[PDB]
Amino acid sequence: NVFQTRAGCLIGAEHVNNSYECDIPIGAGICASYQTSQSIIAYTMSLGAENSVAYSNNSIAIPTNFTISVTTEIL
Amino acid sequence: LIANQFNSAIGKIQDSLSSTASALGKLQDVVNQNAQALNTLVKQLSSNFGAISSVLNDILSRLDPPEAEVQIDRLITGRLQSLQTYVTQQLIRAAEIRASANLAATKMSECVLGQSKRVDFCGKGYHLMSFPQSAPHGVVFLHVTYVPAQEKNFTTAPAICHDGKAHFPREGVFVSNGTHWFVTQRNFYEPQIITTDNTFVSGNCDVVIGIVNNTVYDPLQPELDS
Amino acid sequence: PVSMTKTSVDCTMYICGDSTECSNLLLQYGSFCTQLNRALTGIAVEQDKNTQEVFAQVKQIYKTPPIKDFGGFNFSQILPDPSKSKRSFIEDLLFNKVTNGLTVLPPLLTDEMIAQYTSALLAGTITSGWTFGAGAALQIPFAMQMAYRFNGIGVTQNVLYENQKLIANQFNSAIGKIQDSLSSTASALGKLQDVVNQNAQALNTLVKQLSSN
Amino acid sequence: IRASANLAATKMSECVLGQSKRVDFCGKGYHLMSFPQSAPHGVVFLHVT
Ligand SMILES: *[C@@H]1O[C@H](CO)[C@@H](O[C@@H]2O[C@H](CO)[C@@H](O)[C@H](O)[C@H]2NC(C)=O)[C@H](O)[C@H]1NC(C)=O
Ligand SMILES: *[C@@H]1O[C@H](CO)[C@@H](O[C@@H]2O[C@H](CO)[C@@H](O)[C@H](O)[C@H]2NC(C)=O)[C@H](O)[C@H]1NC(C)=O
Ligand SMILES: *[C@@H]1O[C@H](CO)[C@@H](O[C@@H]2O[C@H](CO)[C@@H](O)[C@H](O)[C@H]2NC(C)=O)[C@H](O)[C@H]1NC(C)=O
Ligand SMILES: *[C@@H]1O[C@H](CO)[C@@H](O)[C@H](O)[C@H]1NC(C)=O
Ligand SMILES: *[C@@H]1O[C@H](CO)[C@@H](O)[C@H](O)[C@H]1NC(C)=O
Numbered sequence: 350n351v352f353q354t355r356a357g358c359l360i361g362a363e364h365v366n367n368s369y370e371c372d373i374p375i376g377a378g379i380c381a382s383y384q385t386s387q388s389i390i391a392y393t394m395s396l397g398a399e400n401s402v403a404y405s406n407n408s409i410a411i412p413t414n415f416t417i418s419v420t421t422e423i424l
Numbered sequence: 425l426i427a428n429q430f431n432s433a434i435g436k437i438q439d440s441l442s443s444t445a446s447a448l449g450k451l452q453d454v455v456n457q458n459a460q461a462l463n464t465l466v467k468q469l470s471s472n473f474g475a476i477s478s479v480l481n482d483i484l485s486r487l488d489p490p491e492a493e494v495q496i497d498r499l500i501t502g503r504l505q506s507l508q509t510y511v512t513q514q515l516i517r518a519a520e521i522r523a524s525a526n527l528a529a530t531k532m533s534e535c536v537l538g539q540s541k542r543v544d545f546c547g548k549g550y551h552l553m554s555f556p557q558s559a560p561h562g563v564v565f566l567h568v569t570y571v572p573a574q575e576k577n578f579t580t581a582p583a584i585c586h587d588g589k590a591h592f593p594r595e596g597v598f599v600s601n602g603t604h605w606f607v608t609q610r611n612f613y614e615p616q617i618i619t620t621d622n623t624f625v626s627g628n629c630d631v632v633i634g635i636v637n638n639t640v641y642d643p644l645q646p647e648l649d650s
Numbered sequence: 651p652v653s654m655t656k657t658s659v660d661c662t663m664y665i666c667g668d669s670t671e672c673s674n675l676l677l678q679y680g681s682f683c684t685q686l687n688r689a690l691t692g693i694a695v696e697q698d699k700n701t702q703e704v705f706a707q708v709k710q711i712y713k714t715p716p717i718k719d720f721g722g723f724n725f726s727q728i729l730p731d732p733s734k735s736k737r738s739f740i741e742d743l744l745f746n747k748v749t750n751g752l753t754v755l756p757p758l759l760t761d762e763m764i765a766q767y768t769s770a771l772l773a774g775t776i777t778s779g780w781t782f783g784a785g786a787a788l789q790i791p792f793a794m795q796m797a798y799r800f801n802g803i804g805v806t807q808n809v810l811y812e813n814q815k816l817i818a819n820q821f822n823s824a825i826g827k828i829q830d831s832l833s834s835t836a837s838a839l840g841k842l843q844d845v846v847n848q849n850a851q852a853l854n855t856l857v858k859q860l861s862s863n
Numbered sequence: 864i865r866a867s868a869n870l871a872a873t874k875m876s877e878c879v880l881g882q883s884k885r886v887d888f889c890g891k892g893y894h895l896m897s898f899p900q901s902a903p904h905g906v907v908f909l910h911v912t
């Protein structure tokens with residue numbers, strides 16, 4: 350049960366194919382987290398759900414409804 | 425609904441702040457950091473620094489002055505140098521805070537006192553307003569940000585021909601619901617009947633890329649005809 | 651500059667590398683190490699915080715569609731090159747102009763990772779306008795975007811389209827010029843070179859001090 | 864570095880993700896747009912003005 354990464358030798362973590370958000374940062378793009386029965390996994394941190402945009406000469410995407418949100422910024 | 429949307433929005437912050445104190449890390453660290461600096465500064469008093477003991481009152485009760493002078497000097501050069509270290513930390517750290525304070529003032533200057541136009545300066549999105557809120561050793565803002573939600577594809581073209589000439593939209597972009605062409609504002613869909621009252625003239629159809637044949641309505645003709 | 655080299659230093663090796671007779675004398679100095687080692691560590695995470703808040707301003711990672719019909723605007727130099735690191739051409743030059751207890755921690759966001767951001771931040775910028783900062787990125791054909799972007803300095807859209815081909819050509823030829831300017835003088839990247847240099851100097855000066863009586 | 868980084872972020876935040884109106888903040892001229900490009904330890908912008 351050993352994973353080798355560019356930052357060093359990480360023991361105690363199962364290497365995982367699936368990418369998820371980073372919970373704890375390790376180095377060289379590998380992040381660890383505690384998931385399900387549960388154990389510690391390390392993985393290539395997902396940069397998020399990839400996307401792509403239906404670019405065209407001839408279309409627009411104009412929203413029909415919005416939100417009024419509130420977030421907190423703290424200084 | 426927008427009123428209610430804002431109302432329900434605010435109550436959510438009540439829960440998120442109430443649920444977790446982790447939301448206030450950016451203030452808690454500042455209290456934490458200074459508390460750490462003080463604790464380190466306090467603990468240094470116990471270090472012997474090479475002196476026979478770390479209590480001044482001992483050394484004075486322990487040695488006569490001609491030899492105690494040497495030992496006390498060891499603390500002084502060390503303990504001062506630790507205090508010197510702490511002050512340098514504070515100056516640098518205070519600059520960081522003062523950097524945020526000026527940023528805080530500017531946000532209060534431009535996001536409370538008015539609507540900022542700097543993208544991602546008052547939270548993600550087309551900013552509306554902010555409500556400053558007190559806090560220990562810091563400030564908290566409740567930004568109110570417009571974020572688009574429900575979206576529909578449409579087919580676009582930068583212009584239309586009515587008589588072989590070019591129309592652009594004074595405000596909006598050209599769209600179609602598949603059979604009929606509409607021009608609408610840019611961040612919340614509302615189609616409109618493309619009339620000359622919304623459109624302006626510029627050139628003809630032989631230079632524009634994407635322009636499409638269309639019919640523009642003139643409100644004037646029905647009045648003259650009727 | 652954005653980030654520094656995440657240097658970390660062990661006081662105990664630096665000051666008493668493998669010497670029991672020494673580390674005993676270091677303990678008498680109390681907590682100078684633990685704070686120094688804490689100080690640089692605080693620097694280290696700050697750099698990763700720098701790179702996250704500089705680049706990762708975007709939630710979803712966009713990728714460009716197979717068609718490049720950018721109204722004549724030619725971005726082939728700035729988009730990542732799929733056949734190489736999925737990095738771009740102009741940046742490829744940029745990586746080419748640059749060059750005891752002392753360890754170098756690696757950056758959390760790897761260079762390949764860094765490129766994807768700069769591909770995404772570039773991708774939504776191209777196909778979606780500014781809307782990808784506010785929320786859901788909305789596809790908009792690029793020639794439309796300039797009509798907005800010209801509308802953003804007080805020149806109505808009729809300038810762009812009535813001058814579409816030239817302006818694209820002007821921007822296209824413009825793009826090539828940086829390639830020459832970057833390729834010609836290494837002084838184009840003076841600031842970043844400095845960021846490396848004083849950092850290189852700091853370490854060297856730090857290293858040399860070991861020779862002083 | 865940090866002040867530049869926050870200056871860098873604001874330049875992506877305001878000048879990439881939108882169109883800035885701060886004269887002499889996105890290069891000399893009435894700003895149009897900008898394309899970030901990765902770089903070692905730093906970032907390069909291509910301010911199109
Ligand atoms: C596109 O919008 C137009 C504008 O309303 C629609 O045309 C109208 O359709 C209604 C029926 O729902 C008729 O009563 C009107 O007489 C129509 N207007 C005209 C000028 O003929 C059209 O149906 C819409 N089409 C789609 C596919 O959305
Ligand atoms: C828009 O419609 C006009 C019709 O009024 C088109 O003009 C004709 O174009 C064809 C070629 O496409 C010529 O052979 C005809 O002689 C033109 N008619 C006249 C009266 O000159 C025009 O091409 C259309 N343009 C678009 C972009 O749809
Ligand atoms: C953008 O410009 C580049 C030139 O820098 C074009 O690439 C050239 O394409 C021609 C035709 O296939 C080749 O003969 C050249 O060798 C290519 N040179 C380079 C440097 O790529 C590219 O096709 C242009 N893209 C668009 C969409 O116009
Ligand atoms: C990922 O999947 C590949 C097969 O496609 C396999 O060889 C590899 O061991 C897997 N790794 C993990 C961590 O599941
Ligand atoms: C937007 O969505 C809400 C429900 O979330 C709905 O009640 C409202 O009618 C919608 N607005 C428009 C303009 O359709």
Ligand SMILES: *[C@@H]1O[C@H](CO)[C@@H](O)[C@H](O)[C@H]1NC(C)=O
Nearest residue numbers: 403410411574575576577578
């Ligand atoms: C627009 O069309 C594309 C496919 O052409 C689709 O993936 C996308 O979800 C559509 N967007 C909307 C808002 O309908």
Ligand SMILES: *[C@@H]1O[C@H](CO)[C@@H](O)[C@H](O)[C@H]1NC(C)=O
Nearest residue numbers: 405406407632633634635719
């Ligand atoms: C956009 O690309 C399509 C190819 O699918 C082409 O047929 C069309 O003419 C292009 N639009 C313009 C305005 O040239």
